[PDB]
């Protein structure tokens, strides 16, 4: 009942089954056909970087149904709202509720059991809409039906042209701001990241498209007639934001302490909130200090933030400068063909934070070899 | 005079100089250096496929001066008319007469000797116009100052807005053909290839951007309001050049012998001008008879036009078609979402090349093992 061929089987299925990932066609039919056989024998055969508070749970509730291959998270308001998962099997019906298990954040899963295939209409999704109460601004009203491993989607929605009078920022988080793009009107409008914003062409005192929705309004997608070239935004913008913000990730945020966080981190020392701590934790560190030496306020204030080698020279070689007491104390870019590279407006957007750590390691340097 | 000194000098640029590619930064400077010392003591230390007849060419001319690391040509016309060479310390002056003794076609070399910099205007380049007599629609007047490896560029033109009524092709070589924009004025209107076509929203019967020159005049790209995808552009345009037409590279061509060309290229066979001829050069071939005899005619004469494997699929399955004698007659692609793809449209413009030598061996293989 159990002899030698068996045997074989499974041993094809052994050396095979971990080398499906590229094998030949062959070995994938069959081991279509021996997943098939031995399980009733052997009855075993554009997203971007989530940091690890999501992925921790991710790796967890990946473990409830190995036809998950993926997780589907709606990034909203700096929140991770999961919706389901890409299971093969498993109905999400217990994925939520485990990601609720795991810290996921989800949402409110008021699901009408629909009998025959429909799309909802102005109650039919108006009444869900209150139920809700999505304080996060989530606008796709999808139904799944148990039985399949789709959606229905239902959203109905007007547009319009908005008279922007000026930009904003808005704390939602730790030091953490978005745009609220505010109207001739008195209305504040809605979008995603900085990245939507600058897709926009987004300026101030004319109308653009906006996508008014009942619960949320959100600032809607270009279409029109673009000369202004790409970098030209980023100046404006960037400006606009004022001098106290650069962007990280998707961003804002003030400069501050921080500076001396990333700075102490450099050199493998201890943290110092204030800068006679550092320079007295650099004082005491003979290596520190000897390695500090060598260098230059420049060379040591762009490895602390990590712009590659060069195309940095390419910016600053494009800019006019204001210097009392060999310190920054003001900056202007005058050619913007240069923000038409990618890899260059990382660094620009992310400038005030390098002026910043400039001015302090210039200072430590002076009262540390004084 | 000789020691072992420079023996060992010349030894690590032995060593470091074919590693100079990709060689760590210190050896670069040091052979930087010894090119230097050497020198004095041992003396020697968006463009696409362009084919073979001016590769060759090409290659002679690169070992003029080994500081040319590629050529610049302007392909017009279905010419590659060179104009100069990225070269380092050799002025171009022999480098087109050189590229003129290889059979690379130059331009009309008339450049004013010019002492101060200077911008050319009406006349400085109006009669410089008139002696270059340009067949082919090279616009860019720049001249080469001498001890030096830039040019000043120069030119002028308006633009405006042309009516156009319909659009046509226009044989410039051996069964290839060019758009050539009709307008409800009378006049013709260039473009460079069927791609500035299809990116140039081009319709019948409205206005659109035209820059206007002289000697030239071209239609402008677009800047307006794109709302109309590309796949329906694609399918307009393939339909209205006609069924007689597929896409060769940047040109058009006629369907013809071409297919049986390129089916006896499949089957190692000789060159058969018509069908019969064919036919027997098979039955002759026990090989090549009983190499067909298990194949379809849909996957042979899809392997003969080297379509990857599937894609192909997703087109098939979205016209429908028209067959008697199970032959195909006409056929129409109804749904254009899958147009947007690349890989897609690459195949659906050269469709009518398929449908042609699909005919021709389902006749082949009707009669052989008739």
Redesign the interface.
Known sequence: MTSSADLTNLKELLSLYKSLRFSDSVAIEKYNSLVEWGTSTYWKINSFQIPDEIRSACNKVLDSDNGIDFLRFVLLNNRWIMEDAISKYQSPVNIFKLASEYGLNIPNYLEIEIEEDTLFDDELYSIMERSFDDTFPKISISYIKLGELKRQVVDFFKFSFMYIESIKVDRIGDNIFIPSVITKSGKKILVKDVDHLIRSKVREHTFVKVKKKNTFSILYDY?????ETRGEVIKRIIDTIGRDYYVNGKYFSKVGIAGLKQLTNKLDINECATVDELVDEINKSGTVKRKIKNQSVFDLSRECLGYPEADFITLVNNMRFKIENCKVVNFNIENTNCLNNPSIETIYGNFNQFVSIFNTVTDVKKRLFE
């Open positions: 279409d029109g007639n673009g000369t």
